[PDB]
Amino acid sequence: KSKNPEDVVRRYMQKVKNPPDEDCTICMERLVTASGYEGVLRHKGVRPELVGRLGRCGHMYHLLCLVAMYSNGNKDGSLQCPTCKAIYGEKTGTQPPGKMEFHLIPHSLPGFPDTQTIRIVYDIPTGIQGPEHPNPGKKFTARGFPRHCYLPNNEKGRKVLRLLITAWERRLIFTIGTSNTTGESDTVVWNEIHHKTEFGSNLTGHGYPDASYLDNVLAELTAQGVSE
Ligand SMILES: [Cl-]
Ligand SMILES: [Zn+2]
Ligand SMILES: [Zn+2]
């Protein structure tokens, strides 16, 4: 679906024909008067008097106010109610094309004795940045691919695997930006979901044993709108 502010916002807003004499809590003007937003998106846009009820919670805003607010955020397809903090829609990212593969290997991770290991392999080729990327039309590099990641094949590890597949499908695993280890810009980097790339030790901090890892990555996934 389109992630453009006006389209996303209109999707979750339901027109209020006769709004009350109460504040819009985005612009702090009354709902029976025009939106207080005065920026560039007003030009030939949403009529400033239009008011809607947002999603399931029903909180009411000038439609223009909520498109302005959404446009000042990440514009990731999800829309948060500023009154009650309910989130509507699905967060997606800018991960470029590639391949995600996984299978089982007959080796136990440190801290998960007598198990097999889920080996995940991500492969992302170089390409041209698209309109969703920081420098549209500029080439982007992709370093260190294929990247190998590991989870134990136990109940919680399989759960993480299901959720990583969803995050991959929502283009959330990788993004295009600046590497933290090299400083290179216009390059494929990890996004907000940590992976373990070191199998038999944790000298890098990205390895095992790590008894908190599975719970930690489940929280990161939930922070990206990916949960069961
Ligand atoms: Cl990276
Ligand atoms: Zn308003
Ligand atoms: Zn609400």
Curated annotation (Swiss-Prot):
Ubiquitinated; undergoes 'Lys-29'-linked polyubiquitination catalyzed by ITCH. Induction: Regulated by NOTCH2. A zinc finger (RING-type) spans 24-85. It is found in: Cytoplasm; Nucleus. Widely expressed. Strongly expressed in blood vessel. Also expressed in embryonic nervous system, pancreas, lung, adrenal gland, digestive tube and muscles. Expressed in MZB cells and developing B- and T-cells. Signal peptide: none annotated. Coiled coil: none annotated. Belongs to the Deltex family. Homodimer. May form a heterodimer with other members of the Deltex family. Interacts with NOTCH1 via its N-terminal region and EIF3F, the interaction is required for NOTCH1 deubiquitination. Interacts with EP300. Forms a heterodimer with BBAP; the heterodimerization leading to an increase of in vitro ubiquitin ligase activity. Interacts with ITCH. The WWE domains are thought to mediate some protein-protein interaction, and are frequently found in ubiquitin ligases. Functions as a ubiquitin ligase protein in vivo, mediating ubiquitination and promoting degradation of MEKK1, suggesting that it may regulate the Notch pathway via some ubiquitin ligase activity. Regulator of Notch signaling, a signaling pathway involved in cell-cell communications that regulates a broad spectrum of cell-fate determinations. Mainly acts as a positive regulator of Notch, but it also acts as a negative regulator, depending on the developmental and cell context. Mediates the antineural activity of Notch, possibly by inhibiting the transcriptional activation mediated by MATCH1. This is E3 ubiquitin-protein ligase DTX1. It comes from Homo sapiens (Human). The gene is DTX1.
